[PDB]
Amino acid sequence: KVCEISGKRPIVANSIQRRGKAKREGGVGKKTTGISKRRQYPNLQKVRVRVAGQEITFRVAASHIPKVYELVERAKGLRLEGLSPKEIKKELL
RNA sequence: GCCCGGAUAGCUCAGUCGGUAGAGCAGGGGAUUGAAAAUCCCCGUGUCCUUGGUUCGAUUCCGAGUCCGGGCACCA
RNA sequence: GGUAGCGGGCGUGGAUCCCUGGAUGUCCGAAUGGGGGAACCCGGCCGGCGGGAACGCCGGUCACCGCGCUUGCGCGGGGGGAACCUGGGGAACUGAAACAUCUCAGUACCCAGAGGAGAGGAAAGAGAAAUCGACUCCCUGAGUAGCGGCGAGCGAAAGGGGACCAGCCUAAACCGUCCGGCUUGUCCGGGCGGGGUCGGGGGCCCUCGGCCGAAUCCCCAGCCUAGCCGAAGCUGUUGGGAAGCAGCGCCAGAGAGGGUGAAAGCCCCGUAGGCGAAAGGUGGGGGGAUAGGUGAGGGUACCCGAGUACCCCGUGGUUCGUGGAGCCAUGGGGGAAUCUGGGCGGACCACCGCCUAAGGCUAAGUACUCCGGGUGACCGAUAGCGCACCAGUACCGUG
RNA sequence: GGGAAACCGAGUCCGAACAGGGCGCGUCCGCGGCCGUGGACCCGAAACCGGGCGAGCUAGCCCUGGCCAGGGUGAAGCUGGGGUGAGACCCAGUGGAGGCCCGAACCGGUGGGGGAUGCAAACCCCUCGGAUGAGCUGGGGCUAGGAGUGAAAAGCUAACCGAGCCCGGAGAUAGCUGGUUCUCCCCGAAAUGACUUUAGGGUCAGCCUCAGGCGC
RNA sequence: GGGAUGACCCCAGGCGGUAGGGGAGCGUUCCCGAUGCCGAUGAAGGCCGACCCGCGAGGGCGGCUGGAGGUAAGGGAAGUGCGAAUGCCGGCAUGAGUAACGAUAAAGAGGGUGAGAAUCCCUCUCGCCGUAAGCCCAAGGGUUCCUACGCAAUGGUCGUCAGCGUAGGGUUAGGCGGGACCUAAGGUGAAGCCGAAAGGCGUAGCCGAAGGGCAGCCGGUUAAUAUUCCGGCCCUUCCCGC
RNA sequence: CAAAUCCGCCUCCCAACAAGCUCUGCGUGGUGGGGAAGCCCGCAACCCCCCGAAGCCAGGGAGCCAAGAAAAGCCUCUAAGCACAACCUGCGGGAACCCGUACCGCAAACCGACACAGGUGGGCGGGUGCAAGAGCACUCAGGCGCGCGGGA
RNA sequence: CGCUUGCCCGGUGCCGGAAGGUCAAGGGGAGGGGUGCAAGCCCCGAACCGAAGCCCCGGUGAACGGCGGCCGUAACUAUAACGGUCCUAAGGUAGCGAAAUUCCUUGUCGGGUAAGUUCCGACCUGCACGAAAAGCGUAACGACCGGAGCGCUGUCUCGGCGAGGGACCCGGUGAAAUUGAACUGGCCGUGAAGAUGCGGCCUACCCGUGGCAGGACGAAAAGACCCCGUGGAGCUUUACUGCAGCCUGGUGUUGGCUCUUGGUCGCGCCUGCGUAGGAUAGGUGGGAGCCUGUGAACCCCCGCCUCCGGGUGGGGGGGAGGCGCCGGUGAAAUACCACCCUGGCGCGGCUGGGGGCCUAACCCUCGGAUGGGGGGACAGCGCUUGGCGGGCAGUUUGACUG
RNA sequence: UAGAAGGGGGCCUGACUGCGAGGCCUGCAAGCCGAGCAGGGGCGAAAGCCGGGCCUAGUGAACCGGUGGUCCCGUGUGGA
Secondary structure, eight states: OOOTTTOOOOEEEEEEEEEEEOTTTTSSEEEEEEEEEEEEOOOEEEEEOOSSSSOOEEEEEGGGHHHHHHHHHTTSSSOOOSSOHHHHHHTOO
């Protein structure tokens, strides 16, 4: 699934199996014994964090963890209550 | 093809951190006992592969040649 | 209405009939009060009807999600569409005279989204020209340059001819205000407003002020949705019938065509030519109005889009299949600078040049044909659409 | 025009070479024959892949109901009697157990005959297996295509399953088999060789034909 | 060879033919020729001929049929010629008056009716079923129920008959069965979790029945309905008032 | 998942293969209906014995191991509330909606292209005889002779 | 159910082994190269450290599996209790045996029959039984397969008669596969080698109805069998290549405090005893002076190293003296000062391994918690490295060929 | 084939570079024989002979790579 901050989501990539010797060394070069489709995923993770009274957690790529703690800070100038951890986040840019 | 180890007594192997060439086994002479062994004394044996060079000389230290032994790859 | 028949009616006091606007429109269906085996059952609240409290009708109103403004109130969305379009996923038969890389192919297909189109789009561009100057589309370039078990095969771009013609708004410094935090400070950060948009510009300090103009609104012309006017021939004869044949005439901006008992410019409907809208659509094509935008110096060096550029690992796009492998995109790890900044010109270094990434919009030229009209060295009932006829019907299948 | 190219040019390339030697004197449209790419003369597979439709037939399990005439055998346990120091134990009576027995309904299919353009795309007659259980059965549910289910045959999954049906890719491919439509005139073959994952298929040579030229 | 090239006369040779190569023609559809030409005193198409012209494919001529179209000379395009494909569509033949007429429970006579009766109606004999071949419900079917007129077809024969044709009748509920009650497997699904899209899970809730809950018995009437209509006896809920 | 006078746990007066209060079945019951075989369509009893369920009283009893649905209606306990409400027991008068109901239904009307010798769940299924029975033979009620026939 | 289930861990599998060999990314960088005028910027790259797997050492049978040959010998002959020799991981035990296993085979004896390739009992030269793909047995059970008797019969010698439903004749209704056209005979021959159809001869007036199956190479199904096609599809494995899954090193999510050790670069101290020689000489260069109130000679208290000869560092006292050249020996000589690792200690940076304890990420739990317990930087997950991998997929497995 | 191709010695390296008229063989592509000119050599006094071996088998197209050289190309220019 997808990063709530960065918008990164799984992609398709190939998997190329080669044998043989680099041309760059010894020679003749490499042959592709096979190729298959497969997918790469974003290293994502949970970040739980304070903000107001409620708990509110984010499921974000590891590479943007910081950007959450940054968002917490710059929502210090903002009126936040209402039994709605759900709307805090929604109202959280 | 590329990177490691090695050659020393008949066999199998230990060495000065440059100045000594040494073990075990086998073979041989004797001690021995009912037989065969196991004890125990005693000796034989060298171009240290190899040609060069460092050096006061070198088995050791370094260029190089040679063969035996490993290790990892490529093959149109 | 497709009219025949009973059995009744209407109309120059202008009917039937055609165009435009409105009214009414059960039940199902995205289906939305709730339920459900689609067209059926069952409710709440407010009002109405019956003698009407129990019963039953009638009208109004009650789904969920997303955005905004004091929990209510406002805007929106949902589904369908012959092709045509963009994005996310994405085969195999086959070809290679076997097959595995390669090919068929980013094809068939699935999914989401857009609209009368869609996509793209104003240079971190092309590439070698003392060069060009957004994007799309056609003709060349060219089966060229290249890619390739260098096999089978795949296959660019620049440049030249045309079509169309258009350019714009923000982020950031700096300034003002409203609100809510803190360690109550000339402070931190949030919403508006102002400033500001570039191949060098902008901000801040000090000395000089004028046209360009909508893609937004308004008005017209024209056009679509009913219709109207239209020239000129008689007789005889053969014949079931004249439009044939014969005598004597006439029109033509009209001798396209169809019809009439056979074969007709002048009998009928038309054709050439010319007319017409109260109402609804359309509409810079032609006129008007705003919104918006236009200079120069000299100094400070405060700002120019960040987990980004950049390097490394894994992949995709391109003619490029690891190759000397750049450029453009990016899942993972590390990780800057603000113009003495940064990317590109096919590893790399140095010279010489090109361009300003990390926010957005933007007509026209192009695509398709459910729909209407025009044509045909197209078919003429085993043809042509599957259907000229009551056909996606009868009939076949659980579907 | 030569050359891989730099390049040179009526020449140019290998070469030291005024040796030798290799290559070096029209276009446009119409018409007709043949070739390449596209189904490319027409009909035909067994199969492969994609998206859907099927558990109202059949297989398993889940929820809730229903059904099994009448006979037969007689487990344990009770109660009494006996036995012993106490007991084990042994008798009678009672009692009604069980993937027990006979046999309908009901579930099944063992042997033989009939049927064989059938009454019937699995039937009929005689005979036979089970029948309180690992039992049969109605209604409501769930699992699917390299997947389900299976007391296990590769069985079943809507009258043909060693991988269902429908539509599409699609006019797959088919070195194989079949078929190919009016008339007259002139000429008229081959069934050999070489190579071929080749051997009933091909490529070159050979043998048929037409046009132009040459002329014993 | 003539050679007044005449495509006509004279002379001399060649002419079996599969795969194939080459050369000439004939016919089918459509276009120019066309605002023309033929045509009811008869177009196209159809049927006949012993006649005329062509080597032949073909083309003329004549007679009958047909009733509104046809289209030269000279040229141009192509869906252009069938006997075979276990070819495709349709029509009609052969087997042939042949095998069959769907349980071996079984028939006979007399009266009706009618154009017409082995096959319809009535009566009397005979035979077959009777944990059925009888009666009552559930599913599924969808007017087949009842009546009046009928018999072309459907019926394995016949048909005056019918589950057939035309037309009109006929299904009545507080208490029977479902729904304005309940929950079962399972399904759906607030909160909530997951997945490239499509979508997959899931607490409470909701749907879901032949299981739980729940008030009707005995008689009579129709051509065709009956715990539904009618009669006697016996019940259940709501609402208002005392 | 204390809110209870209800449940559940202790403790002690009475009371116990009972009585008492309940709730079903069958019997009877005011009275209402029905009512053969027989002639051309028609006279109005209803009593006594015997066999007897697999049905009823039903949540009955015993034995056994494999240890045998949920929820509402229905009783009771209290919450907020409310006590001029509100329930409960009689008695009177009102009110009581939607859908199905013909016919075939082991079959010629359903599944099998057919008026097909096949397939199809629940209840009733009389009498006599053969040991029993839903078995077998005949037979009640009721229904049929199977939509081609005649001769040899 | 009963009685039992022997021997072989060479090879395959699985289980155990903190050593050792091989080993990918990664760490590390001796040294090389391209370019710049250079600062630099760019490529390659050797030692060494570096997982799972593999090698290696062991275990393991109700784990895959396996369980011998040739010659000789007893006072008749026959045969061998005994013996020799080769091979193996080990050489088949008990029990059964011409068998659902036996080729030779109808083995040979016996039983049953008048006669018995079958059947039952025996014997073994078991082509080719054998212990949990169990061995030898076993009351009761069986629409299972074999061999026998008794009873009874149309099964048969060997057929007969009879019944009903069809077959046949008449009235009504009326199909089918098949079909080049047909005026459709025998024998010998002939022919693409099995003739109604050609040749010669022989037979035979025209047309039907009930019967039979020898022929029309009769009908039906574009042969399963055999080939053939560089045709298809299901199954297998130590066939090829991949993929799901599982294992594993480095990273990220990932943090505190200790102890213990590696490798590297700094520096600061040591380190060295052949023969001779004052005495324990590392090299090479410098070198005529150095040391002491920056308290020297001598003694005692005390650490470390040793070739046991000595070398060297501290503390306390004490007082004014110490060394080299020269000399002499040796290849090389001395005091003092330099760069230099031959090996070692001490603080340093720089990364890198193992042990513990913590709690605060992550995960599990607790009468529902802004909290308490438990695990804990491990586990899970992202990217990446190498391995195992018929559990799954695509395919290849030649031609000639009397 | 001894009128040496056989046996023995001396000096050598033509087991050359650049070409090659003309033919054998032949579907293709391959295989074979080769006089002669230029250059620089060996043996011989010279004539001359030598472009491996008495002769006919001892072999493998293209593709992809390795090493050593050289006139060539070198993605704006120099170099890589």
